[PDB]
Automatic annotation (TrEMBL), chain B:
The chain holds residues 98 to 207 of 207 of the full protein. It comes from Sus scrofa (Pig). This is Large ribosomal subunit protein bL32m. It is found in: Mitochondrion. One of its GO terms (biological process) is translation. Coiled coil: none annotated.
From TrEMBL, chain C:
This is Large ribosomal subunit protein uL14m. It comes from the Eukaryota. Belongs to the universal ribosomal protein uL14 family. Coiled coil: none annotated. The gene is MRPL14. It is found in: Mitochondrion. It comes from Sus scrofa (Pig).
Automatic annotation (TrEMBL), chain D:
Its main location: mitochondrion. GO terms for cellular component: mitochondrial large ribosomal subunit. GO terms for molecular function: protein domain specific binding; structural constituent of ribosome. Keywords: Metal-binding, Mitochondrion, Ribonucleoprotein, Ribosomal protein, Transit peptide. Mg(2+) 1 binds at H3. This is Large ribosomal subunit protein bL17m. One of its GO terms (biological process) is translation.
From TrEMBL, chain E:
It is found in: Mitochondrion. It comes from the Eukaryota. GO terms for molecular function: structural constituent of ribosome. Belongs to the bacterial ribosomal protein bL19 family. This is Large ribosomal subunit protein bL19m. The keyword Ribonucleoprotein applies. Keywords: Mitochondrion, Ribonucleoprotein, Ribosomal protein, Transit peptide. Its main location: mitochondrion. GO terms for biological process: translation.
Amino acid sequence: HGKSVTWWDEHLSEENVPFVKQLVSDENKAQLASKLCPLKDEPWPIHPWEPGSSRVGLIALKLGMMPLWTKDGQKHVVTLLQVQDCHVLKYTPKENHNGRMAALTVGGKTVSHFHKSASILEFYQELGLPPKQKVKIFNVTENAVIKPGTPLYAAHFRPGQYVDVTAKTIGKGFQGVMRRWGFKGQPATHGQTKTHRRPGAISTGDVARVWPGTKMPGQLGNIDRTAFGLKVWRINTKHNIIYVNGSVPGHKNCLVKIKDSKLPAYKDFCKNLPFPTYFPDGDEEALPEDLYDENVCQPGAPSITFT
Amino acid sequence: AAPKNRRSIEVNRCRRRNPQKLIKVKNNIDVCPECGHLKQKHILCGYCYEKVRKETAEIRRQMGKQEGGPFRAPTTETVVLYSGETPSEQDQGKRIIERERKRPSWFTQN
Amino acid sequence: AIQKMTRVRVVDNSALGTTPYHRPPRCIHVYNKTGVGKVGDRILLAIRGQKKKALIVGHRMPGPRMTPRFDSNNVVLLEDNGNPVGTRIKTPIPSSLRQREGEFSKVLAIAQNFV
Amino acid sequence: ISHGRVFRRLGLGPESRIHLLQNLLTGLVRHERIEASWARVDELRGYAEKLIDYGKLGDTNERAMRMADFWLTEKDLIPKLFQVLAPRFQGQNGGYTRMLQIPNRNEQDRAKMAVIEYKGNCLPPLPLPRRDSNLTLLNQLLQGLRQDQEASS
Amino acid sequence: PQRPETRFLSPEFIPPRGRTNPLKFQIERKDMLERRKILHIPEFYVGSILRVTTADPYASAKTSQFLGICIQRSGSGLGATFILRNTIEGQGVEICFELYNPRIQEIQVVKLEKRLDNSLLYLRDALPEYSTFDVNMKPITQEFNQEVPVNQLKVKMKPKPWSKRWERPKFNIKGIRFDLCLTEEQMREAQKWSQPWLEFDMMREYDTSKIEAAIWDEIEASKNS
RNA sequence: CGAUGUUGGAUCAGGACACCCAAAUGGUGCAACCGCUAUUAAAGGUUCGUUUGUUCAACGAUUAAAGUCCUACGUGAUCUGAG
Ligand SMILES: [K+]
Ligand SMILES: [K+]
Ligand SMILES: [Mg+2]
Ligand SMILES: [Mg+2]
Ligand SMILES: [Mg+2]
Ligand SMILES: [Mg+2]
Ligand SMILES: [Mg+2]
Ligand SMILES: [Mg+2]
Ligand SMILES: [Mg+2]
Ligand SMILES: [Mg+2]
Ligand SMILES: [Mg+2]
Ligand SMILES: [Mg+2]
Ligand SMILES: [Mg+2]
Ligand SMILES: [Mg+2]
Ligand SMILES: [Mg+2]
Ligand SMILES: [Mg+2]
Ligand SMILES: [Mg+2]
Ligand SMILES: [Mg+2]
Ligand SMILES: [Mg+2]
Ligand SMILES: [Mg+2]
Ligand SMILES: [Mg+2]
Ligand SMILES: [Mg+2]
Ligand SMILES: [Mg+2]
Ligand SMILES: [Zn+2]
């Protein structure tokens, strides 16, 4: 049976296309707004912080870059990372994922139902959430497990902390050896014939082969990379924006995996942080509009005087 | 560079018949509701468009005879009228194109 | 940015830096590990057939924000002891050189105009 | 690396690209329906949208007249643009032209064709892709949801 | 006589063309308006003379003065910059200040002017008297009814070579005396790079009229709040 | 010898340790500083210029150091042709 290909908009009439869009749109708002009570829907028990514990990261969207100045007069560049829709999806037991730490699954920003696989749509239907764009796996200890379906916000990170960033870098396509690896080129005018950017000799005569580690032209850029030791300067509450020092890998409007830094110096720097995550309902208090690091010159602060 | 040995037909058959190099079938072929011919889903019907293009050429050919000069163009809107029809009140003030054949079914008067 | 083989301008009153010569005072070697020197970096000069150390006070390549940029590579003659051979400097000198006072005390003592 | 490049390389360079679209745009204004290669028609759509915007400015605005002088290479089309096309389009803001994919040309090159035209032209209508009628089985089932939804909400 | 009113919007408030979530521009815009409440940044164009007071730690007095002509304005959002040109003791000094740097104490315009060009980078190769400005000149105040009068001042030039090829049409420089420094032969050769189709390509123009109206309301609301 | 294309550079370097630097240590006619000598270790590094076609060598400036040698004295179906 050579069944023809179909899409959601094929058989829909002009009087029902606006209706179906309204139908799915109203479902998303009802589902998202019904998850805003993590501590009122029988959450899993919360344990006190312990040494060597790891928290849960987020999935955020990279907006752009801004300049930022400190109280000593130095200038720093911060990248605006916005958390749009972050929900923990599924929890994997310790003995079924790695044998040392449990795994928590976190989704990305909301996408349309009409362009996802049947299994993917069915999986979210049971949980009751709209489909996500990117899904990542986080390694979390057993003392910091979160019930799936619990929303996460940018307040999960407090200013002053050092965080990592993992995302796909900018893909530059099939680039030559000079751009990919940085080999020097041949001279341009001293008689050189049809050789200005070629790698040159690639091996030795005796071996009569090319070693597996040899550098050759090929794909460049579209791979997963991680940046370590990025300090968090400012946290925005209402818009859920995180400011990270330096440059994070990935192009604009991409999805970025954020986690606590794993560097040896930045160990156990979570006692003074929310655990296992920031629950806005439990505090019953309104956080400040913006959270500033102690060294950041605020926009509504008097001008710097070196007296 | 020059080849070192002749490629055997066993190797050539594998390369010349690989699934990538074969012609892929098309699953987006549909029958046109109006004329019953074949067309793709995202492409206008070849028979129906050819029906329109032939008529459009006839209309444009009549316009050429109504403006002899190569740089004569109307400053007003244009309306095309077929046999057995007269200009409407809203159609007045516009150039009139007369065609002897009966008004085609697909073409709709306003 | 001043590197090897760059014509420079001497901005202090000295017998060597003022007497005309048929070859411009060029750079020989910059003591930075990178082959290019910036403001406040030592440099070796070839003036009138002899080799003299110097300190770069102003270049033409743009630098960090709120740092003055001049229209001529300006250097100040210097000895092995770090004491400048000149008496006074009339060309303005960037104020960022006052950050280093341990080794630039004598050079900054004779400066007149700061920008 | 062609990241962010919205324009296309056509003809013999950037100057020939404008002239190729200059001749196509002139033909589109005079005849109100022309067919060309799909890539060239796609580029022509952007200019045909904004040319009407310059036409709405008026016959007196100097910038519009100079802009229409360059693009309309035939000098008997400038009065047509300011007195036929511009007055016709006063309601809609961006719905000026339609683009549809004509089947491949019956020649050796087998190029991908497209048809570009202005709204309300004095020509037989193109065989537009008509959507399913509301009486279809799938549409009737969905209309049941809407009638029930509107009854309660 | 009458006094018509016109709006002035700082160039850095105009968002760049590209693909960035407009939410980023709002975040920068809010911070810019908060900074402008404390630091009064006046209206100044390219060619106007400004005196900027910064705070340097290594000076005897913590403040630092600098007066010169504004060569150019560039940048967008919180990182807007402008360049001041001044010649003292025969030495040309250029400093690229940052508008929103918290080390700026005050910004004062001693002469509000607009010149025939939009980027006065051709003063490097101009004669020294066109770059020398008195450090202690008194401020000049003008009435609003002058509409920022334009200063038509042709500038002499040093003999070639220059820093850049100002003869090329890509710069569109008309504030330079080309007849005195160039001959007819060189003028015709520089026209071989002219691209007449650039001014008629209607897809290359940025239409930001709708965007400016939106940000004007936010600026007006900030003052009222 | 019905052809294994030949010096030096350019590009890319693979390897050995009889190690130039970096790390650990014994001895001294080793007080300290600067040295001389021996054992152990090859993951990384080993500069830019004037003259000569030059490898080599001389000279100027510097560096933690400007190592020795093999690889068809690596590498011309990648380039250079000054000799
Ligand atoms: K032989
Ligand atoms: K080695
Ligand atoms: Mg790409
Ligand atoms: Mg090169
Ligand atoms: Mg040849
Ligand atoms: Mg070549
Ligand atoms: Mg082998
Ligand atoms: Mg590839
Ligand atoms: Mg001599
Ligand atoms: Mg493209
Ligand atoms: Mg071509
Ligand atoms: Mg397109
Ligand atoms: Mg230059
Ligand atoms: Mg043989
Ligand atoms: Mg070699
Ligand atoms: Mg090696
Ligand atoms: Mg040994
Ligand atoms: Mg050692
Ligand atoms: Mg050899
Ligand atoms: Mg050779
Ligand atoms: Mg060859
Ligand atoms: Mg070979
Ligand atoms: Mg020879
Ligand atoms: Zn048909």
